[PDB]
Structure formats: C-alpha cells, structure tokens
Design a protein around this ligand. Structure first.
Ligand code: FES
Ligand SMILES: [K+]
Ligand SMILES: [K+]
Ligand SMILES: [Mg+2]
Ligand SMILES: [Mg+2]
Ligand SMILES: [Mg+2]
Ligand SMILES: [Mg+2]
Ligand SMILES: [Mg+2]
Ligand SMILES: [Zn+2]
Lengths: 50, 52, 115, 190, 291, 109, 164, 232, 77
RNA sequence: AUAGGUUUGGUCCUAGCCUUUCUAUUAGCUCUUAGUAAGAUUACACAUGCAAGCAUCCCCGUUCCAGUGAGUUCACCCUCUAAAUC
C-alpha cells in the first residue's frame, strides 16, 4: 500500500487550527434582536423563542 | 396488564408447561421512572458548534 | 460496511409494482436504503384486501422479540401494526386519530340534521 | 360452422374422424416448414389472423370440427404423454401458441373436474401432533378489563384535563391556539 | 373402555383385513421416467429384496388416525371499541416463527369493530398454507370436492384418488375431510366397491366407519364371496368388541359361537340383510365341500 | 479465541535451517482441480520457531500456532518432530526402522 | 473416454458418497503406507479410493501422505487439543479403515441430522424475495391475493391515474 | 412428402420391396433411401429396409439409372436382413458404445415416451427396425455407409436379459423409480441357479465417457443440447 | 439529497416555519397517552432484553449445554 | 448438437470456415389500443430552477439517501477491539 501522508498531515493541521481558532461563546451565542438571527452563522432562531 | 396477544401467549405457554395458576400476567413499571421531557440533560455530553 | 453511528430498526421495505404495494417487515440499519440490505426479514404485510376481504400480516414474533432485545428501534407504522396485532399497546396516535374521525363524523351528522 | 360445437366429443366417434385420422393422433402427420435442421424454439402465435388461415395451419387450426374443450377428453389426451402425464410442448406437435395455451387450459380444467385421469400422490400429514389443547386454538382466560367492559388501558379513554393545565397551555401558546375540543363522541357517529 | 381406532388390537385386525398386495401398492406411476437399473441376484437376494419391499409397503399402508370433528374456535382476546369504524377491512396476523407446531401457532384477527379475536379453523388452515405451503394443498378449496365432480370421480372408480386429494387438501379433523370421506364410504357401500380400497391405507378407516355405523353387511358379503373367511370372522369380532352390549355379542357368548358360527349369529341377530348373508355363506360352504 | 493465527496445527517437511532458531517448513494440502476433479498437492512455506535448533532438513515436523506472531513470517512453533530424517521410530511398535525394515526386531523385547 | 484407471473416482457423485465427516477436533491426518507388501494392501486402496472422499467431505482438514517410511501402515490424527490418535491399519481392508475412523472420530448420523435441521431454518418458507433465497418473490403470487398488474390489469378504481 | 431436406434423397420412401425370385412377398417392409452419390456417369445408392418388428437390413446398389439402382439396392437388402432384439419392443437392451472405422456411435437405452433423439439417418433406421425410444450421439467422421454399418453391428451384437441370465445363472432384477422398491424379475436362468452371489464390487473399473459425466454434473452448457424439436 | 457544501435555494431565503396551532385539551391528553405508552413499551423492551441475555447464558453455560459437553467429552474418551 | 454445407477426376482421413438455435444494441423499412418492466455513447463541458432541515435559542442532521464505473485482489472468514443501539 502506497502511504497516504498528505491525508495525515491535513488531518493534523486541521485539528491544530480548530483547537487554536475556537469560536468563543460571545461569538457563537450572540443574537441580533432586530432580526433574531445569529450573526456568527446567519441562521434564524425558531419562532416559538422570539 | 400485558398487551392482549402477548398475555394470551404467556398464559398459553404457562398452561402448556403444566402450570395452572390463575394469576394474571403482569408488567412491572416501578423501575421504569418517567422523566419529564424538560428535565435538564447532561451538558457535558453535549456538542459545540464548529468554527467556520 | 461501516456507517457513522446508526442503529438497527425494524421497518417496512416496499416491494410490488405500481399501484400494487407490498411490504416486507425487515430489521435493517437505519442508514441503509429502504429496499436495500437488511439483517433479517421478520415478516410481511399485504395492504390490499384479498378475495376474502383481509389484509394479511405475518410477524416472526420470536425474531421480533429477539431483535428488540438486541437494541433494535421501531418505525411508527411498525408500532401501529404491532398495536393492531395486540402485541403492543395501541399507539397514542391511533387513538387520537380515531377520536378526530369520530368528531369529524359527528360534525357531518350535525350538518345533515341542520339541513 | 360445425354440428359438434355443443357436443365436441361426438366428432371423435363419428366415422368422418375415423376416415380422416384413424387411430393416430390428429397431429401425427403434421410437419413444420422452416429453414435449417434445428427448428425455431417457438411455434407461430396463431394460424388464424382476422378470420384468415395461414398456408400451413396447425393440427387444431386445420380442422374446424376439432374443438378444444375440457369435456373433449379424448382429444385432450392426444396432447398429453400417456407414459409421463406431461403436456407436450408446442414444437412437439406443431400447434401454434394460441391453441397450445387453449389446450393447456382445457387440460387443467378437465383434470380439475375429474374428467382426465392424472397421478395424484400420497402425501404425509401436515402435523405430527393433532392435539387442540393449546391456548392458540383453545380459550384464553378473559382479562379483568375485558370482563368489566373497560378499555385494556385507562389511557385509551379521553379524560378532560383540569382547567389549570388548560390555562397553562393557553398561556404557553398565546396567539397560536385553535378551538378547544371537548370529549369525543362515545361511539362512532353513523 | 371401548377400544379406540389406534388400539393395538384394532390396529392389528385392520392391518390384516386390509391385506398387502405389492403389485397394487407399488403400481407403476405415471410421471417423468428414468431408465431402469438392473441387478444380478440369487434366490436368497431376491427373497431379501422382496422382504424389504414388503416392509416399505407396510410403511406406505400406515393408516391415518380417525379424529373427531374439531370444535369451532370462538374466542375474543380484546374489544378495543376506540378502533371501531377506523378501518374498513379486517387484519389477519399470523405468527410465523418457524419452530412452532401449526396447531399451537397463534393466528389472530382484528375486526373493523375493534375486536381482537382468534382465527377460525378455516382461516388458520388458509394462513398456514399461505406461509408454510404444503405440496398438494391449495389456498382455495378445489372444485373437485363439489358434489357433481366427486360423483364423476366415483363413476370412474377413482375413490382412492378422491381420498388422496382429500388427505392432501383438508386436515383430518376438519368438517370437509370427514364429509368427503363419509360420502366416499357411502358410495363404496352402495356399489360394492370395497376391493378398490383393499391394500390401501384407507381400508381401515372405511371398516371403522362401517362398524361404528352398523352397516358391515356388505363388507361381510364381499369378504365371504372373495373367500376371505378369516377377514369376515375378524370383522364380526371387531363389531362385537365395539358393541359388546348388542344382541349379536350376547348371542355369540350364549351359543359359544366361533369362526363361521360367529358370522351365523351375526346374520341371525343384527344383520339388515341376514338372509342374503346366510345364502352366501351356504354357497361358500357348499363350494368348499365340492372342492 | 486462543490465537490470531489461521493455521492452528500443521504437519510439514523441513526444507531450510539457515535462519537462527527458525525452521523453514514445506506444508502440502490436497486441493481439488475444478475441471479434472482430481486432488493435487498445493505447497505453502511456514516459518516455525525452533529455539533449540533440533530440526534438520528433510524431517517431518508438527507445528503449533503461536498466540501472536513473533516476527513478520514466524507465526508457528515446533510442537514436535514426527519423523526425524533417517532416524524413524515405528510409532506402531516403538522400534527403530530404516525404511520398511526393522533395525531392532519387535520380538527382541 | 475419461483418462486413467477407475475414472469414477473423479466424479462428484463418488466424491460425495463418502460417509466420514470428522469432528471439529480433527485438524491433521497423516497416512503412512507402503507401496509394496501384501499386509498393507488395504491401506493402499484406502489411499486410492477413500482419501479423495474424506478430503471432499472435510475440506479444512490437512491430509498428508507418506510412503515407505515405516515397516507398517498406520494413520495418525492430530486434534485441536494436542491429543494424537494412532490407528494401525495393517492387515485391514479399506472398508474396515473407513468404518473404524468413522466410529472413533466421525460425527454420528444424529449430529449430521441436527445440522441439516439447523440449515433448514435459514430458508424460511414465509420469506418473500429472490428465487435464489425464497420460494416466492411477492405476495401477488399467492392464490387469492391481488395479482401482479403485469399479468392482470388492475380495475380502474384502484389505479392512481383514474383516482386522480 | 420430402426427405431430410427439400432437395435431398435421404429419408425418402421407396415403397415395399418387390416380390423376390424365391417367391416371397414383402408388403410389410418399408424402404428408405439413406444416400445417393454420383460415381464418375453412374449412381450409387445406399438404402435400408425393415418391417418395424426387428427385421431390418441395408444395401448398396450401383446402376447408370437411378431407379435401377433403387431396385437393385432394395432387392439385395431384403435378402441380407438382420434381426434386432428389442427390450419391450420399444428400445435397446443396454447402452452400446461402438466404433466402426473412424465413426463412433454411442447409444443409450431410454424409457417409454423419450422418442428418437438421434442422427437423422439413425432415426430413419430405428423407425424401420421398430425402436421407438433411444438416444444416440455420432462422433468422428460422419460417413453414412460407416454409420449404417456400425449401427447395424452394434444393434445386432446386443445381449438380451435372458442371455445374461443364462450366462451368469442368476435372476436379472429390474428396479424402476416409478415402481418403488418392488423387484421386477425380467429374466431367470433356464438351467440351475447359482447359490453364490456376485462379488459386491466396491468400485467397478468401468470406462466412463467425459460427456456423460459432464452432462450429469451440470457443466455441459451447450446451447444446442435439449432443444425443442418435432416428434420423432 | 444535498450535501452541506451545496448553497441554499434563493427562493427559500425568507422562509419561516410557523408552528401549528395547538388544541390544549387534545394536547394534554396526547401528552399523557404518550407517557403511559412509552412506559409500557420500555417495560416490554426490558423484558425482551432480559429474555435475550437469558437465552445467551443458557446456550453458553446452561445445564443442558453442560450435560451435552460432558457427554461428548466422555464419549470421545 | 440429432447435426448440416464446403477441398478431389473420384474415395477415405485430417482440418479450418460457414449454416441451423437464443439474447442484447444500432441501422433500414413498417407501426393501432391497454397494463407492466426497462431506459445518454462519453469520470467531456455545463445556462437555468429545484434536491436539507428541524427545533423555545443548545445541539442534532446536512458523513445518510441519490449518482457513476474512472481506478481496482480495501468486499469474505477467524482473532482482537474502538465508535454506535439497547
Ligand atoms: S411482483 Fe408482485 S405485484 Fe408484481
Ligand atoms: K434539532
Ligand atoms: K470501473
Ligand atoms: Mg425447397
Ligand atoms: Mg467440416
Ligand atoms: Mg469439387
Ligand atoms: Mg428496428
Ligand atoms: Mg464501547
Ligand atoms: Zn394453429
């Protein structure tokens, strides 16, 4: 089997970059009260919570 | 009580094996405690939104 | 084949032809296709009434009990079928639908009386 | 027009049939026209197309007095092997597919009516034990609910919720409420 | 107690009365044929092969048990009135677990009214044939069993074929099985066709029916005419043990009747056609003396 | 359950002894020819651990599977020497033999 | 004609006529026999006629043969436990050898019947599926049930084209 | 009616043989042409005759005119008749494998209703003989004269059940699958019967044919075998 | 079906899934019915699990299996 | 293969080619109705519109289903043992 080292390198780099670029609670759980959407993702909250 | 068909099978097997008890087959539900759907869950096991 | 997560479920796989459905009650991985690979066939269900006016349901109850005891889930139509068989309690939604149909027919009868 | 339509079997003990065929099968002298030494593996579909016969009609279609009927047992026997009871395949006798299907149906009907003798084997019993004592075929003791006329479980019946719970739900679903439903009809409305 | 049809004594009497004709028992079947095989055999080897064939014939002639008509199944497992009117057709639920005897297999019906009940015998048989098909059985009753078709079969002297079809189609304790067997026996008795069932597994059942219905005159006549005097005497003895309180048995005890004397006492006491029995017996005795 | 090696017990002939504490053994099995329906010998090479170096080229040995492979190709060990090359002891009578003749007569004891 | 002496040996019927199914303990069978000498004659026939049948019925059992290594012919069986079973076959006929090995290390007929019954359970007759696995494809093949639309067109009322 | 083909002489009937100089009539015999060949001009014809009851023969006739050749061949054939033994007057007594020169013929006894599954010339000759059920395979050179000669030799050298019983001094017992384990004695020795049984041969040293075995085991895949054909 | 890399449809940018209207009485009765049904079903599932594990234990180290193993070992001896 | 045609002035033998059988695709010409099944040549490039949401916010899902046959002994059995369901 030909070694697949680029895959391992990519996996390790992605893991490192995810554990150094963690989004914080202030970013993840912020809300725009006028539109009731998460600015981090843009996804609208369910109606029953508005 | 057991469901009708399952109760019938339990009784039929009981009679086949020679036992002639008249006691109804019965399901214990004491150990099945019904938790309200809004009871707090384990936050430790919950995931997190991935950065992107 | 390894699926990410998933579980065994007892469900209905559709066979037959156009306008003529037939169901095989099978235990299969929930991620597998509806009519694809399965672990074991646990019965059948012909939804069309036959020449005797009957809907035939075959249930391999020993194997159904075995697979439930092995951690298999159940699709809602399968739960309703087992409720009709008397193997399970009648599903809440069957009772609710029966009550809703009763109320609708009462409304229709009241309309007829009003007219 | 044949005078034997109502009673086809008559044609087989008429002297005309004896002159034409004698004691040999009605298909004995027939021969298919084809290229090569190996014939095609199916016969023609039908010798009669829009009330017109083809050049070489098959044994059944060449004689209009021969009627494929389940009561014409003597004719049907000529298309069944007397030593094995197996219906000859169509290229064996040269009958077209239509008449072969008709003969097969007639033979099956004659066998089902007891008019054609066929081998009926002797089989073993379905079950080893003939007891009828099991609960599957005997009577199961009625459950107490079945005696008392109650549902199998109490929750099968509608119970009006308390007013406090209904008010709590009306507070929870402000502005998205539908008309409150009372207890359902006790029986199915007719 | 009164003997059963499976009693070893009754079984032995009926086995000897049936007979064992190898040529009839192993008549050439009309089926797909294969080239025969050939063996060089001594006299001893031929005798051993004949004995093995006799054993195979004995296995083939084993008598089906005679069963009483099954009682109808009328049992309600539940009455869920909430489901009434929600469905237009009944549901039939068959438990198809492999290792269960078919008479211990749970088959239930959910009716449109909401009643969960047990299946009837006919429904049970139909479902078992649906899911566990048996060679020779059909889901729907064949039309051969109608009155006119069975009359045709009788007119062709194909009674054994009718009984084989009945055995393949119906269960022994079913109403249809009992009715068809009884009508075949009645035809045989009415037309003196007892030899048709000899050396078959149905002769014992036919004899049992005749004895239990007190109509052994025709069979006794046939046995006397075929010079099977031992069979007739055994038939009379079986009649006596089945009906030990009848006039015939008491007369046989009183007169110490044995052998042909038993037949004479039966003809004088409890024969619907005793005069013709006496005539045939006298003819048999006269021919025996002449020979 | 006791081993991860497929071949549990195998009889073979020693064909090599040039490795340290390892015997190279030739094992033949009978394989059916699908077309001819005749059984032919199929050969496979096995490395067997021989701690004492008691194996000689040409002797018939029994090999038992190791619980786990001790090397890339060494998955078995020498359970015993069934037939020492040129030093066969007749298992039936227990006497030494040279081919089909008794070196020591069975009657001698 | 078929090549070789006794070509019947190279037929599947002959190979399946074998009656020795070894227990699961037997792993290896060594057959030591002599090419010459009347006393081992039966053993030679055992190699000629019965080893193919034994191998056919026991594919995973290693069978190995040895010639003219000992004064007498013998069989040795090696078991999974490490036990070895020695069977002297000198002065015996090949039938005697077959019967002996069947008796001492062969599965009895009861166990084989139990295995066959266990096999039967896998092919459940009530299961519907391909002919390769099931007696029937679909419930439409059962008499009295609604037939396939391929053969019998369904009435206009139960078809979606005329229900819409 | 046509022969094996529309333009072929083979299979054509020539009618009954003419009354002979010996004074015998042959109205119960039928004649069939097997081959017609130009000899370089004259004509050589191979014909076969038979009464359908085991009496059959064949002959070569050479003449400048075809009809004279037919007559010569037919008249000579009636005076060189074979008698062919038939098992139950419908088939042969046992399988026959023969080679005449380079032509191999392998014939198999078959049950009733099997019909004649044979080379067309063999079908014609079997109809003349009265054999109604048989299988035959012809291999090697397909030479009509050699085929006819080999067929007649093989059919004339078959051992009946009675001959086998007299030779071995034992009962010949027939086992039929349709008749169960019933032993049917088809032949018994006319002389005394041996009290010693035949050696129960564990494995007979019979020469098997790879075609028969391959057909039995299911590795014969020929698209030409077991094809539907007209009744023969 | 779409993968997580496929963009959302432009026709669905402004879509709100309005929750369905609620009937208080039926809602409450349905909640109670689901609770009771799920309790019964969990009891049945636990019984089936106990049955399965019991069958496994009986197959591996049951009295019948022990006697069979002893008989087989002896008969081999 | 139940075989057949074809080398020579002729016979026999050997030997190839072809015919007869059954499927699939495409082409010509010709085609009425009903039911069912199946349905790009191309791992070439793609306009356009849809194919993943749900839900009192967290999460969960979008790693599935659906598609293709480019590459190609990763698929099967045993041992061991994660993740997952109960
Ligand atoms: S295959 Fe069953 S309906 Fe078509
Ligand atoms: K969610
Ligand atoms: K590919
Ligand atoms: Mg022409
Ligand atoms: Mg050629
Ligand atoms: Mg030329
Ligand atoms: Mg076209
Ligand atoms: Mg784990
Ligand atoms: Zn026609």
């Amino acid at each position: 089997v030909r070694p697949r080292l680029i895959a391992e390198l990519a996996r390790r780099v992605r893991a490192l970059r995810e554990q150094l670029n963690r989004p914080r609670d202030s970013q993840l759980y912020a809300v725009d009260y006028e539109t009731l959407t998460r600015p981090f993702s843009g996804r609208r909250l369910p109606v029953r919570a508005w | 009580p057991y469901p009708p068909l399952l109760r019938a099978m339990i009784i039929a097997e009981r009679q086949k094996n020679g036992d002639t008890s008249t006691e109804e087959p019965m399901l214990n539900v004491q150990r099945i405690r019904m938790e309200p759907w809004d009871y707090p869950a384990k936050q430790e096991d919950k995931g997190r939104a991935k950065g992107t | 084949k390894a699926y990410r997560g998933g579980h065994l479920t007892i469900r209905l796989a559709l066979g037959g032809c156009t306008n003529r459905p037939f169901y095989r009650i099978v235990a299969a991985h929930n991620k597998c296709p509806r009519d694809g690979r399965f672990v074991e066939q646990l019965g059948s269900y012909d939804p069309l009434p036959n020449s005797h006016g009957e809907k035939l349901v075959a249930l391999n109850l020993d194997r159904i009990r075995h697979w439930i005891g092995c951690g298999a889930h159940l699709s809602k139509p399968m739960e309703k079928l087992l409720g009709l068989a008397g193997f399970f309690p009648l599903h809440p939604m069957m009772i609710t639908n029966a009550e809703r149909l009763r109320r609708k027919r009462a409304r229709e009868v009241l309309l007829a009386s009003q007219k | 027009i044949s005078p034997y339509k109502d009673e086809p079997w008559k044609y087989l003990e008429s002297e005309e049939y004896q002159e034409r065929y004698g004691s040999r099968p009605v298909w004995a002298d027939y021969r298919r026209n084809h290229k090569g030494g190996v014939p095609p593996q199916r016969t023609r579909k039908t010798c009669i197309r829009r009330n017109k016969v083809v050049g070489n009609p098959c044994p059944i279609c060449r004689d209009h007095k021969l009627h494929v009927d389940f009561r014409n047992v003597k004719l049907l026997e000529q298309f069944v092997c007397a030593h094995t009871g197996i219906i000859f395949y169509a290229p064996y006798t040269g009958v077209c597919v239509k008449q072969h299907k008709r003969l097969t149906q007639a033979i099956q009907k004659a066998r089902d009516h007891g008019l054609l003798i066929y081998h009926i084997p002797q089989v073993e019993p379905r079950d080893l034990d003939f007891s009828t004592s099991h609960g599957a075929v005997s009577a199961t003791p009625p459950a107490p609910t079945l005696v008392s006329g109650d549902p199998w479980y109490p929750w099968y019946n509608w119970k009006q919720p308390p007013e406090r719970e209904l008010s709590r739900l009306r507070r929870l679903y402000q502005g998205h409420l539908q008309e409150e439903s009372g207890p359902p009809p006790e029986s199915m409305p007719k | 107690k009164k003997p059963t049809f499976m009693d070893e004594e009754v079984q032995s009497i009926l086995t000897k009365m049936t007979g064992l004709n190898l040529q009839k028992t192993f008549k050439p079947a009309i089926q797909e044929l294969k080239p025969p095989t050939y063996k060089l055999m001594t006299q001893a080897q031929l005798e051993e092969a004949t004995r093995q064939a006799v054993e195979a014939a004995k296995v083939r002639l084993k008598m089906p048990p005679v069963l009483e008509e099954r009682v109808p199944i009328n049992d309600v497992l539940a009455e869920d009135k909430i489901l009434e009117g929600t469905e237009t057709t009944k549901y039939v639920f068959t438990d198809i677990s492999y290792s269960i005897p078919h008479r211990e297999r749970f088959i239930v019906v959910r009716e449109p009214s909401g009643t969960l009940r047990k299946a009837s015998w006919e429904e049970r048989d139909r479902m078992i044939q649906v899911y566990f098909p048996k060679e020779g059985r059909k889901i729907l009753t064949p039309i051969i069993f109608k009155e006119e078709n069975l009359r045709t079969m009788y007119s062709q002297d194909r009674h054994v074929d009718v009984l084989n079809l009945c055995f393949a189609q119906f269960e022994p304790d079913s109403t249809e099985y009992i009715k068809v067997h009884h009508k075949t026996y009645e035809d045989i008795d009415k037309r003196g066709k007892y030899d048709l069932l000899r050396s078959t597994r149905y002769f014992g059942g036919m004899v049992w029916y005749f004895v239990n219905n007190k109509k052994i005159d025709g069979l006794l006549i046939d046995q006397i005419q075929r010079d099977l005097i031992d069979d007739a005497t055994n038939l009379v003895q079986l009649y006596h043990v089945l009906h030990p309180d009848g006039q015939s048995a008491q007369g046989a005890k009183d007169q110490a009747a044995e052998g042909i004397n038993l037949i004479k006492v039966f003809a004088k006491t409890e024969a619907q056609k005793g005069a013709y029995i006496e005539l045939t017996l006298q003819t048999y005795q006269e021919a025996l003396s002449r020979h | 359950v006791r081993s991860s090696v497929h071949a549990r017990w195998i009889v073979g002939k020693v064909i090599g002894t040039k490795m340290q504490k390892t015997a190279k053994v030739r094992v033949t099995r009978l394989v059916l020819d699908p077309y001819l329906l005749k059984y032919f010998n199929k050969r496979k090479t096995y490395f067997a651990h021989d701690a004492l170096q008691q194996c000689t080229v040409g002797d018939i040995v029994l090999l038992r599977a190791l619980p786990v492979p001790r090397a890339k190709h060494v998955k078995h060990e020498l359970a015993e020497i069934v037939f020492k090359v040129g030093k066969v002891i007749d298992p039936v009578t227990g006497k030494p033999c040279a081919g089909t003749t008794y070196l020591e007569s069975p009657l001698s004891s | 004609p078929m090549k070789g002496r006794f070509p019947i040996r190279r037929t599947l019927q002959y190979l399946s006529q074998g009656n020795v199914v070894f227990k699961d303990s037997v792993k290896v069978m060594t057959v030591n026999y002599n090419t010459h000498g009347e006393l081992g004659e039966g053993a030679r026939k055992f190699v000629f006629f019965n080893i193919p049948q034994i191998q056919y019925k026991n594919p995973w059992v290693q069978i190995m043969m040895f010639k003219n290594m000992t004064p007498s012919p013998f069989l040795r069986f090696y078991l999974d436990s490490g036990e070895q079973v020695l069977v002297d076959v000198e002065t015996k006929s090949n039938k005697e050898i077959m019967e002996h090995i069947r008796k001492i290390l062969g599965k009895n007929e009861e166990t084989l019947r139990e295995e066959e019954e266990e096999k039967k359970q896998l092919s459940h007759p009530a299961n519907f599926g391909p002919r390769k696995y099931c007696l029937r494809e679909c419930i439409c093949e059962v008499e009295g049930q609604v037939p396939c639309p391929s053969l019998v067109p369904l009435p206009k009322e139960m078809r979606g084209k005329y229900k819409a | 009616e046509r022969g094996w083909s529309g333009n072929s002489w083979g299979g054509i009937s020539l009618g009954p043989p003419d009354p002979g100089p010996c004074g015998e009539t042959y109205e119960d015999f039928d004649t069939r042409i097997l081959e017609v060949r130009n000899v370089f001009k004259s004509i050589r014809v191979l014909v076969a005759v038979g009464n359908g009851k085991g009496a059959a023969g064949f002959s070569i006739g050479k003449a400048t005119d075809r009809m004279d050749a037919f007559r010569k061949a037919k008249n000579r054939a009636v005076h060189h008749l074979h008698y062919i033994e038939r098992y139950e007057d419908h088939t042969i007594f046992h399988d026959i494998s023969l080679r005449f020169k380079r032509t191999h013929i392998k014939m198999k006894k078959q049950p009733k209703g099997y019909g004649l599954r044979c080379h067309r010339a063999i079908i014609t000759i079997c109809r003349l003989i009265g054999i109604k059920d048989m299988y035959a395979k012809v291999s090697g050179s397909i030479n009509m004269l050699s085929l006819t000669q080999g067929l007649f030799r093989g059919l004339s050298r078959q051992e009946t059940h009675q001959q086998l019983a007299d030779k071995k001094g034992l009962h010949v017992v027939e086992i039929r699958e349709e008749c169960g384990p019933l032993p049917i004695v088809v032949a018994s020795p006319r002389g005394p019967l041996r009290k010693d049984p035949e050696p129960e041969d564990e494995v007979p040293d019979v020469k098997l044919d790879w075609e028969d075995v391959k057909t039995a085991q299911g590795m014969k895949r020929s698209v030409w075998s077991n094809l539907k054909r007209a009744a023969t | 079906r779409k993968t997580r890399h496929d963009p959302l449809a432009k026709s669905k940018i402004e879509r709100v899934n309005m929750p369905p209207a609620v009937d208080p009485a039926e809602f409450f009765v349905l909640m109670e019915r689901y609770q009771h049904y799920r309790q019964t079903v969990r009891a049945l599932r636990m019984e089936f699990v106990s049955e399965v594990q019991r069958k496994v234990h009986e197959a591996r180290a049951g009295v019948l299996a022990e006697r069979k193993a002893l008989k087989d070992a002896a008969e081999h001896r």
